[PDB]
Structure formats: structure tokens, C-alpha cells
Ligand binder design. Sequence first.
Ligand SMILES: [Mg+2]
Ligand SMILES: [Mg+2]
Ligand SMILES: [Mg+2]
Ligand SMILES: [Mg+2]
Ligand SMILES: [Mg+2]
Ligand SMILES: [Mg+2]
Lengths: 290, 290
Amino acid sequence: NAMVPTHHAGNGFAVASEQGRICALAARGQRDLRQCVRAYPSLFPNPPVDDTMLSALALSTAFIAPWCSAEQLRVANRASLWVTAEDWQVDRVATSDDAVRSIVSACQAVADGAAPDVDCALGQLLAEIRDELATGAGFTEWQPVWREEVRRMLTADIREWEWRHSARPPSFAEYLDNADNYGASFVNVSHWIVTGDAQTRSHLPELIAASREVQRILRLSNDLASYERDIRSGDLNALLLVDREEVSRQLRDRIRACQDHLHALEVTCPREALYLAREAGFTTGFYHGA
Amino acid sequence: NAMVPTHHAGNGFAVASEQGRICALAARGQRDLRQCVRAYPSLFPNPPVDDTMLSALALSTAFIAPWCSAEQLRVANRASLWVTAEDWQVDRVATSDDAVRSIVSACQAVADGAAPDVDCALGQLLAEIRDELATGAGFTEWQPVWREEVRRMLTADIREWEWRHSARPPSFAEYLDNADNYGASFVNVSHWIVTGDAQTRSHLPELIAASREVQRILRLSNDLASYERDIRSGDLNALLLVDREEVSRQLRDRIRACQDHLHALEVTCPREALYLAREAGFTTGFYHGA
Ligand SMILES: [Mg+2]
Ligand SMILES: [Mg+2]
Ligand SMILES: [Mg+2]
Ligand SMILES: [Mg+2]
Ligand SMILES: [Mg+2]
Ligand SMILES: [Mg+2]
């Protein structure tokens, strides 16, 4: 026990002071989330989307990238909201194989630059985000990268809708392969487009592979936390495909592998790696809620 | 620059994971805050008390004592709420020199064990907290200590009400001497009664002197953040008595002196000192909001 420090108040003060500054940062970010729910209240019903949910969202993006101002976090926050609006339109609103695919097609069209249909709130919010990226981009030729993340996420949403209505569930491995429907990579790439530079662009392929590794971690941590809810709605959950012991051991090992990659990656992408490490850290700790 | 570490993702993950666990802890604490606002809605009007305010409160107590469960933070949270209910009844509701003093007398009476009057919501909430302390106390003879903090806080509320209606303002020094009206020491002592032990009791005098030192820091940091609001309501504010430069230099030096005391104090009160250091850290960082 003598190797364990006797004094902790000094570091205690310093850590708590940064946690307090980030909580105020998150409160400032919550203001744009409210603005967004307001412009499109049809996407954000109350029974799910209340200021409690908006608070948790703003706390996550502030604690994931605490070096950003609230204005710099605008995109990450609205993209995160857009993912939850799109999830809802697909999981709850859609009632047909045809309904889901027209949503997907309409979003892809907007992501590719088409004007949103006037009756399509989901498409109008995406078009707003896309135009924010166009004005805010720190580098050119961001469009192919962003459209690809849109495509990957929407395609995976299709596959999950099919699984919920299919005769046989996917394997655990196949399910984890489908984690783009979580939307984390979509959010990360949106964030990096407005906050990165030319250096960011030349490292985008590696950054996106790391982002997809973190997203698999987030899917496992999400599902371990949401098992009861998922059971309740017939939604797919990793713990239906393997047991909690395998999910937890795999979470542990994936985290340790991912941090080894981030350790290498930070030599070239210090800000990028940090963003991902804090995204994996905050989200797994928050979802676990120990 | 080579002395500055190249690698930050690993520590980034670990810090973010604890921040995420504490944010979930805070969300669990918010549930008792809601329960309390509900039982006494007459004390907690909406124009001030919304879930935004409750969220900030729960985040502060969770980040100040992250080793506590939500159940262990119940008292600290309800005592904090009680201070804001009492502030409101005094600042807004009371309209007379007589009104303020009967509030004070009624609260002191409940703190000393009297039954609250059936028409007195403020007194009923205090009686609930007092009874929670009685059942939850980690040591005997807590009552004289707690009643003294009640008395100090209420007496200072009287003095501030008089200053707002007096011909001459206090000096800066006298104002800072009156910081018990902030309620931080009241909250800390309530917290320590239910979470401390016999060891805590024998160190209470020193712990309370340290608590009062942190409270002066909190008053300065509060006032630097609330200057505009205070100007708006004619409420007293340290920046009316000295200039921002002196308040800021004094905040800096008081913090450094207080952490020197906490450094000594932690040898005997490790958990106590930590609580105070994190209270000073979180609150000054949150109020500053850089
Ligand atoms: Mg979904
Ligand atoms: Mg999803
Ligand atoms: Mg879920
Ligand atoms: Mg007051
Ligand atoms: Mg006060
Ligand atoms: Mg104030």
C-alpha cells in the first residue's frame, strides 16, 4: 500500500475542474440540439426525445471532444440527432419493406446533393447537415467519403430491418459486421469534415477503419446495456447470438486491441486518435453505468 | 516539446470512461431530485427549476463525490435543493423584514427537532432531510453540528436581506465573511453526517473550517459568473465591492491556499479532503465555463 500515493486532493481538484468545464460546454451544446428538434418536431416525439435525452447526447459529444467549442460541436450533435431521427422513422414509422427502402433511397439522394422533398422532414434535416459540411469543410473532396458513410449506414439499416422479419437470425459475427447502423462512423466522419484539415483527409482511410473498430465496441457495449429493452421490442441484440460472457470478453479484448491501434495512429493523427479513444471510453463507461 | 508526451489516447480512454460512468451516476441521482420537486412543487417553480437545472445539480454532486452511489448522494442532492428552495422563499417570496425572520425562525425550529407546520412546505422538506440524517447518520451527536450549520446559513441570509435594503453596502471582506448563505457548508455537513464515521466526527471542526474556506472560493467564482444576473435583480455581488481583477486574483490565491490545507488534511481525512477539493474544482470550472 505505500506505493499507492497518499495525496489525491491536488489531482482531484484538477480533474474535477476539467469535468466541470466540460459540463458547461455540454450545456452550451444542448442549445443547438433544441434548435434542431424544434425545426423538425415531427422527427423527435416527446415519449423518447426529452431534455434528458438531449442532455445525455450533449454530454457525450462534449466529453468526447472537449477541445471543441459548442459551435465546433454543432455538426457532431446534429448528425447524432439525425441518426436517432432516422432510426425512429425506420424502426417505428416504417411498416413495409417498401416504406423502408424509399426512406433509404430518399436520404441517399439528398446526401448525393439532391434537394429534399418538401414533405420529407428527415431529408430536410440531412440536407441541412450536408450544407453545413459544404460551408464548414476543412478540406475538399469530402463528399465521396461522407456519401459512403451515409450509404453504409443506410444499407445496414436495411439489413437489420430484414433480420427482424427473417426466418433465421444472423450469426454474432455477421451482426457485428453490420454495426454501421449504429451511426457512429457517420457522426465521426461528419465531425472530421468540419474540424479536420488536409492532413486529416490524407489519413481518412485509416481513420475510418479505426472509427469502424470503435463502432463495433460501441455496438457490443450498447447491447449489453440495452438487452432488456431489446427483448421488449423484438429488436436484435448481440446477447441473443452469444452469451453475456462472450460479449463481455470480446468487449474487453476489442477495447485493448483498438487502443493498441490508436496508440500507433496517434503518432500521425493525434487529435483523430484522441477523439476515437474518448468516444470509446465515454460511451462504454456511460452505457455500463457502474 | 519533446518532454511533452506523444501518446494521449490511452489516458484519454481511461479519463473519458470515468467521466462517462459519472454522467450515468448523475442521471441516477436526478431521479431523487425529481421525487423531491414533486412532493413540494410549491417550493420549485418552473421558470427556474426545470430538468436542465436538476441536471446541472445532479452532475455536480456526482462529480464531486463519484465514489458514492446515487442512494448515498440522496442527502447531498436534497439538501442542495432545499437551499435553492429556501433562497427563493427569501429572495422572491418574502416581502417584509417580518416575513424573512419568521421563515428563519420556523426552519431553525424544525432543524432543532420541532414538527413543521402543516402550511409550511419549506419546513416539511427540512424535516424530511433531518429525519433522513437521523436514520442515516454514521455517528452520534451529529445534531449540534448540523443545527449550527443551519443557524449560520439562515443568519447569513438575514444579513444579506438587510444589505439589499440598507443605506450602505458591506465591504468586500464583510461580504465574503457572509458566504454561509451560499449553503455549501450546510450541504457538506449533511453529506458527511450520512457518509462519515466516528473518525469523521472527531475531525469535524477542521473539516468544517476547510468547508468554509471552499465556500468562500465558491462565492467568488459564483459572483464572477453571475454578475450580469445580479446587476439585473439588484442582488449583491462581489464585483460591486472590488473590481474583477481583485476578485480573480483572490480566487487564484484562495484556491492555492485551500489546496495546501487539503494537502495536509488528507493525511487524516482522505475522503473528506477529496470531497472538498473536487467540490472546489468542479464548481469553479463549471461556473467559469471556458
Ligand atoms: Mg435502429
Ligand atoms: Mg441504430
Ligand atoms: Mg438499442
Ligand atoms: Mg439567496
Ligand atoms: Mg444563497
Ligand atoms: Mg447568484
